[PDB]
Design a protein around this ligand. Structure first.
Ligand SMILES: *[C@@H]1O[C@H](CO)[C@@H](O[C@@H]2O[C@H](CO)[C@@H](O[C@H]3O[C@H](CO)[C@@H](O)[C@H](O)[C@@H]3O)[C@H](O)[C@H]2NC(C)=O)[C@H](O)[C@H]1NC(C)=O
Ligand SMILES: *[C@@H]1O[C@H](CO)[C@@H](O[C@@H]2O[C@H](CO)[C@@H](O)[C@H](O)[C@H]2NC(C)=O)[C@H](O)[C@H]1NC(C)=O
Ligand SMILES: *[C@@H]1O[C@H](CO)[C@@H](O)[C@H](O)[C@H]1NC(C)=O
Lengths: 49, 37
């Protein structure tokens, strides 16, 4: 989702199905590279539960 | 057939599978009774 070498253009925006698996922010959010991480319907700490 | 062995030659199930949403596959390898819900 993130480590992938070549992204789409926005004009060609890709989309993945994420299902039947465990979805942590525990790595994701804490990787200091993300200049933006802005959540609208839930707060960043409440994603894991 | 001639080779004195049994092997698969047809999988005549379907012709398209567009939006896939669940998948599982096992590790690879009388009365049989089942209930489905
Ligand atoms: C993208 O893939 C990268 C490679 O797997 C991954 O980088 C790795 O990130 C973790 C932290 O989440 C680092 O873990 C280590 O951090 C320090 C190193 O001194 C130790 O305290 C820890 O015990 C642990 O060994 C890895 O060092 C780091 N590896 C590299 C090559 O940078 C990213 O986190 C992935 N990011 C995303 C968003 O997928
Ligand atoms: C499943 O794939 C089909 C194939 O395109 C998608 O169906 C389209 O859906 C849009 C929005 O309702 C319609 O305007 C199109 O006419 C549909 N085309 C066809 C061929 O059905 C459908 O959206 C996909 N389902 C999901 C959940 O993404
Ligand atoms: C016989 O078995 C082999 C696999 O060992 C297979 O390649 C071949 O197509 C089979 N032929 C027939 C006619 O069953």
């Amino acid at each position: 989702v993130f480590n992938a070498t070549r992204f789409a253009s926005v004009y060609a925006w890709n989309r993945k199905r994420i299902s039947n698996c465990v979805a942590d922010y525990s790595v994701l959010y804490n990787s200091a590279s993300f200049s933006t991480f802005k959540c609208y319907g839930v707060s960043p700490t409440k994603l894991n539960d | 057939k001639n080779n004195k062995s049994w092997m698969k030659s047809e999988f005549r199930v379907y012709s398209s599978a567009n939006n896939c949403t669940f998948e599982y596959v096992s590790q690879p390898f009388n009365l049989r009774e089942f209930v489905f819900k």
